[PDB]
Amino acid sequence: DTTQQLSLLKHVLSEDKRPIAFIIAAGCPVSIRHNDAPLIPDVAGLTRKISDSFGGNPDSLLMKIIQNLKTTIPNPTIEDILSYIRLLQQIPMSGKIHDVENSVINALEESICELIEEEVNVDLPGNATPYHKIAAWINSINREHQVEIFTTNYDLLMEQALEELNVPYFDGFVGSKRAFFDIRTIEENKLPSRWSKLWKLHGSINWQLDKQTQTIWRGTPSKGCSLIHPSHLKYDKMPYLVMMDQLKLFLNQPSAILITCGYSYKDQHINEVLSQGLQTNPNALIYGLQYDVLENYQEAKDMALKRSNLILLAKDRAIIGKKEGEWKPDPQSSQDNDPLLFFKLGDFQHLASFLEEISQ
Amino acid sequence: DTTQQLSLLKHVLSEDKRPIAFIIAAGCPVSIRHNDAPLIPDVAGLTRKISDSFGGNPDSLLMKIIQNLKTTIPNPTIEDILSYIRLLQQIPMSGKIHDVENSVINALEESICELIEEEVNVDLPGNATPYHKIAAWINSINREHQVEIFTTNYDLLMEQALEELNVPYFDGFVGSKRAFFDIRTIEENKLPSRWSKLWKLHGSINWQLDKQTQTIWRGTPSKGCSLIHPSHLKYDKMPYLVMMDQLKLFLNQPSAILITCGYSYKDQHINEVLSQGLQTNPNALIYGLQYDVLENYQEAKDMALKRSNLILLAKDRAIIGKKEGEWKPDPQSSQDNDPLLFFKLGDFQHLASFLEEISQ
Amino acid sequence: DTTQQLSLLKHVLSEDKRPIAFIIAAGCPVSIRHNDAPLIPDVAGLTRKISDSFGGNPDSLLMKIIQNLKTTIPNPTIEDILSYIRLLQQIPMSGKIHDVENSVINALEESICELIEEEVNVDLPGNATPYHKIAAWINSINREHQVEIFTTNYDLLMEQALEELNVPYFDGFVGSKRAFFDIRTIEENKLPSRWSKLWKLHGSINWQLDKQTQTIWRGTPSKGCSLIHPSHLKYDKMPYLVMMDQLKLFLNQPSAILITCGYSYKDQHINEVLSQGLQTNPNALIYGLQYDVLENYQEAKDMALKRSNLILLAKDRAIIGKKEGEWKPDPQSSQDNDPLLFFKLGDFQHLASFLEEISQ
């Protein structure tokens, strides 16, 4: 099964007559090895470090909120914690819910934001990162269709990799000192064909908001960024709707190609937008790749079974057109002991190596 | 004479069938009044403050260099001082020329650069600045020909004014984290017609250079910028040649229009490039405006007399096609005492008011 | 002033070469007289009846919420009350804010919704209502441009009036048993030219939501409707964004005409959308009519002064192109005593009579 999938992926990627896009999750930064430790500990690591930062004392309001979410949500998420904190802040919640912190909830959320900014403020070491290989593949061959990249992370690894290898791109912000969010050019869609596009679905650490004019602008990491929200803010001083509209418009392009890397399909809004776009345009294709086993993603199974034009692949099994298949009998492991048939090519490092081989 | 000149300027500016460009010098920032003091004291003010920073002690090497330049150059310039310092640094000049500072010349030039960065790092107060009026005039009417702006200053006032009023522009740098200097798109000249262009002839304070790859990039003001040179650097890690080539190419466009504001025509390279472009394309026009009297600019007189398609205007007299004329008898001053016929409309504030009136 | 305004309104309404639209507020239902009492007591009447339903006892949580809003909002609104209740419900707010009702807030909001449904569930008596006259005017002359109607109310008076007089229309829902919200046909915009359109900005009482599929559908009034929200719900299982997008797209049509009836311009979102649409397309016109005096609407004055293509009219004065004018000296009142110059033609009954006269 590996040979056929590799051949078809090579054939579809070699052709320049179809648009290409990617989805970037925490799996891509976590795949980088540094001092035998992950570069970014992902959402789970950030939640564990956030919990350990304030200690195990139950008197802290953070632990009370965590256990309150545990009562409702079996596995709380830092995104959910931030959403709940902002929801509490949106109203004068001075009651028993915030009895421990009558007004220190703002201080707690500011501290959380500062910790996030400090922990995610790193840089790519050297030129051996998979991002450099991706950029080299992108700029190796000129394509008539622009290549866009979608990411839900906060780190600027992709931007640094693209700018190091001389890859022009447009992120929606135009300017030098305080780049503002221009709207007209986004829907004009008349950029030069050699330019690429990078859309920040969940925002970035360098985005800031000014309350004097209530306007957003892209700058440099300062003491507290106002656009750290995981898609939870006010109405449209909010570019999330524009990004979702652009994603939907891309999904409507004929013969669209999209690849998900490191995404666990655990976001309801992204999943529903992808499903609606796939249903609206049957020609759209999704070559989803999961580093973990298929059994851990029931939502991925449901999405694959719901639409016949979603070729989902995993480490063990795959779903190609509403039918589930397993690994064919092949000598995947040379050792006789534990002959596990695992698709190790789904890793970010293996994907980067495959893309580099395709480019050369 | 005022009425005819105003009418012809209004007619030529109202038409959208010809390209428009501007030249920005220290006159534009010096025209802004703040606390009854100039916002930027211009080159002369910077030289005086630089001299006063180290005091009047002759033992300092800076005063020795100043007097050495005085022996040759009757009026030393901070640009000339920087050029001389860089020329000394380019060779192991450990002799009597640098006897006072055997190796402290680097420290002296770093201190000068830091002082320049600190003194020119300001922001536009309010929205009443002439730059806001210029941006409003630019974005008021959509034009089939893009409007470019040329500046030799280091401050980012124009960028802030353009971004505040939602004016997209292209400055040659593309990127988000560390925008690199893309070359191909500059000569492609296939940008959208609604976009504007801002070219930095003398560089900017936010430009930086990395010696690991010897590459330039536009970022944010850090402790010491490597592109503070007034057009005095190495060979082409130098975008000055590209900017001059773009200016020359603009001068070759049919029916080109260009306006100089605050320029004293004291740069040999800019003057020779303008003269060559005007000679190559007779259709090019230069509506030079000087805030000072005509008698103080002999180079302007020579340039105006050398070419018949350069309509030079001053505070007292003007040269329209190699002939010099004076102010016609008109009641310019209501008071009988001192009936000086001065063209007060040449000031930056008056120019901004005129442009605002034209826009409305 | 009355004659010129009437003549220009007749001329613009007689022409069939421009699109026509209307905005319907509580003023239209309140203008119907029944038993010498208003048919619908509008937002203020609904708030008074809601307050009187639970009595003056301070122990009730509803009065506590009302006084809490009074501390912040000088004049609480039932829409604001519903928004605050839903905001409290969105999080486990079991604290002092909901100390009186630890879990009875759901019962309180269900009771409020049931009371709203019961009070707004009426029918048009006879055929003498102004809605019948509006429908007769609409269907009297075939027009090349479809006539759309926008309403923020919950009653179905317009639907009944249109269906009684055999006026086909499209409201976004397609189906017979459980009409679903079709999306594609909304943006297709290829409906027959004789069809009309009625968009529900604030929803309707017959809309329902199923949580099994989390899907909305238009049906019949049942025991509790899930789409009673005054534009306050979850993300896009929400058609409000589609309605706003359609309104904005209509505002972009050349030579667009729009009339506001009974609207007090007290909604920030509607006002900002209208302002943005008017600024984007200068050809758009807004013939706003207010039954009350101009002095009670400061937001209307600000909107009229902000844009030069908004002809606002009131009972006493008017603003035609950023300038405010008063009533010209005319014998508006025959009686000498109290010669008040009031534009009585701005009433809904008078407007219906004028439209009927224009039709015949």
Map tokens 């269900």 to a residue. C110
- Hey, is the C-beta of C269 within 8 angstroms of any chain A C-beta? yes
CA–CA separation, A110 and A328 (whole Å): 52
DSSP state of A292: S
Six-digit token string for A335 = 């050792």
Resolution (A): 5.5
**Cβ pair A195, A148 in contact under 8 A:** no
Chain centroid offset of residue A126 CA:
23
Of A84, A96, A269, the CB nearest to C94: A96
| Contact yes or no for B324/B297 (Cβ under 8 A) | no
**Considering only CB atoms, which chain C residues are within 8 Å of A280?**
184
Q: How far apart are CA C345 and CA A230, in angstroms?
A: 52
Four-residue CA torsion sign, C28, C29, C32, C33:
negative
User: Which amino acid is residue C340, in one-letter code?
Assistant: L
**Sign of dihedral through CA atoms B330, B332, B336, B339?**
negative
> A127-149 burial by CB neighbour count: b if 16+ within 10 A, else e?
eebbbbbbbbbbbeeebebbbbb
User: Closest partner residue to B192 among A163, A175, A188, by Cβ?
Assistant: A188
Number of alpha helices (DSSP H) and beta strands (DSSP E) in chain A: 13, 15
Tally Cβ neighbours within 10 Å of residue B58.
Answer: 8
Q: Inform me whether the C-beta atom of residue C97 falls under 8 Å from chain A C-beta atoms.
A: yes
By residue count, chain B amounts to: 360
> Distance (Å, rounded) from C-alpha A90 to C-alpha A249?
32
Cα angle for residues A271, A274, A280 (degrees, 5° grid): 140
* Best B153, B165, B177 residue to mutate vs chain A (most A CBs within 10 Å): B177
Question: What gap in Å lies between CA C179 and CA B208, rounded to an integer?
Answer: 62
Query: DSSP 3-state assignment of C255?
Result: coil
Q: Among partner residues C92, C95, C96, which is closest to A72 by beta-carbon distance?
A: C92
Instruction: Write out the two tokens for A148.
Output: 């866009």
**Contact criterion met (CB < 8 Å) for B191 and A192:** yes
**Which chains are adjacent to chain B, needing at least 3 Cβ pairs under 8 Å?**
A
Q: Count of CB atoms within 10 A of residue A24's CB? A: 25
Query: Residue A176: which of B122, B183, B159 has the closest Cα?
Result: B159
Contact A289, A263 (CB under 8 A): no
In chain B, where do the E strands start and end? 20-24, 33-34, 37-38, 147-151, 169-170, 173-174, 179-181, 196-200, 207-210, 215-218, 257-261, 285-286, 311-313, 318-320, 324-325
Is residue C200 left, alpha or beta, with left meaning phi > 0 and alpha meaning psi from -120 to 50?
beta
CB proximity A199 to C under 8 Å? no
Q: What distance in Å separates residue A93's CA from the closest CA in chain C?
A: 7
Chains that touch C (3 or more CB pairs under 8 A): A
Tell me how close the Cα of C97 comes to any Cα of chain A, in angstroms. 6
Centroid of chain to Cα A236: 22
Say if A93 is an interface residue toward chain C (CB within 8 Å).
yes
Residue A234 CA to residue C19 CA, distance in Å, equals 33
Residue A34's beta-bridge partner residues? Answer: A37
Look at the alpha carbons of B135, B137, B141, B146 in this order and tell me if their dihedral is positive or negative: negative
CB B89 within 8 A of CB B106: yes
Which residues in chain C have their CB less than 8 angstroms from residue A64's CB? none
Cα(B215)–Cα(B237) distance, rounded to whole angstroms? 6
Q: Show residues of chain B in contact with A156, CB under 8 Å.
A: 176-177
- Residues preceding gaps in chain B (C to N > 2.5 Å): 236
Q: Do A194 and B184 touch (CB under 8 A)?
A: yes
- The CA distance from C79 to C121, in Å, is 18
Please indicate if any CB of chain A lies within 8 Å of the CB of C211.
Answer: no
Q: Which residues of C touch A67 (CB under 8 A)?
A: none
Say whether B176 and A175 touch across the interface (CB within 8 A).
no
B305-312 long-range contacts (CB < 8 A, ≥24 apart) are B306/B275, B307/B275, B307/B278, B307/B279, B309/B278, B309/B282, B309/B283, B309/B284, B309/B285, B310/B278, B310/B285, B310/B286, B311/B285, B311/B286, B311/B287, B312/B286, B312/B288
Q: Does C188 touch chain A (CB under 8 A)?
A: no
A-contacting chains (≥3 CB pairs under 8 Å) = B, C
Of A85, A80, A77, the closest CA to residue A108 belongs to A85
Sheet holding B318-320, edge to edge: B311-313, B318-320, B324-325
Long-range contacts of C120-124 (CB under 8 A, 24+ apart): C120/C40, C120/C154, C120/C155, C120/C205, C121/C205, C121/C221, C122/C39, C122/C40, C122/C155, C123/C157, C123/C160, C124/C32, C124/C157, C124/C160, C124/C161, C124/C164
Asked whether the beta carbons of residue B176 and residue A190 sit closer than 8 angstroms, the reply is no
DSSP-based three-state secondary structure for A331: coil
The shortest CB-CB distance from A175 to any of B159, B177, B180 is to: B159
Nearest CA to B171 out of B206, B198, B205, B153 is that of B198
What six digits make up the tokens of A356? 């580099």
DSSP string covering B170-222, please? E-SEE-SSSEEE--HHHHH----TT-EEEEETT--TTEEEETTTTEEEE----
DSSP 3-state assignment of A260? Answer: strand
Tokens of C166: 């055999």
Chain A contact for B191 (CB, 8 A cutoff): yes
Contact A33, A160 (CB under 8 A): no
Query: Chain C contacts of A94, Cβ < 8 Å?
Result: 96-97
Instruction: Enumerate the residues of chain A whose CB falls inside 8 A of the CB of residue C235.
Output: 269
For tokens 């200053």, what's the residue? B153
Question: Which residues from A are below 8 Å from B162, CB to CB?
Answer: 175
Method: cryo-EM
* Alpha-carbon distances, residue B211 vs A168, B109, B226, C153 (angstroms): 22, 18, 10, 67
- Which of B176, B197, B214 should we substitute to test contact with A (largest number of A Cβ atoms within 10 Å)? B176
Phi, psi torsion values for A37, nearest 5 degrees? -140, 150
Look at the alpha carbons of A171, A177, A181, A186 in this order and tell me if their dihedral is positive or negative: negative
H or E stretch including C196? strand C196-200
**What is the number of alpha carbons within 13 Å of residue C66 lying toward its C-beta?**
17
Q: Is A104 on the interface with C (CB under 8 A)?
A: no
Place of tokens 């943006």: C187
CB contact C87 to A (< 8 Å): yes
Cβ of A163 and B177 within 8 Å?
A: yes
The pair of three-digit structure tokens given for residue C357, joined into one six-digit string? 């006269």
From residue C114, how far is each of A90, A270, A323, B65 by CA, in Å? 28, 35, 47, 89
Q: Look up residue B253 and give its two tokens.
A: 């466009």
Chains B and A touch (3+ CB pairs under 8 A): yes
Per DSSP, what are the bridge partners of residue C197?
C148, C170
CA atoms within 13 A on the CB side of C71: 6
The string over C155-183, giving b where at least 16 C-beta atoms fall within 10 Å of a residue's C-beta and e elsewhere, is bbbbbbbbeebebebbbbbeeeeebebee
- Give the chain A residue nearest C92 (alpha carbons): A97
Residue B201 near residue B260, CB atoms below 8 Å: no
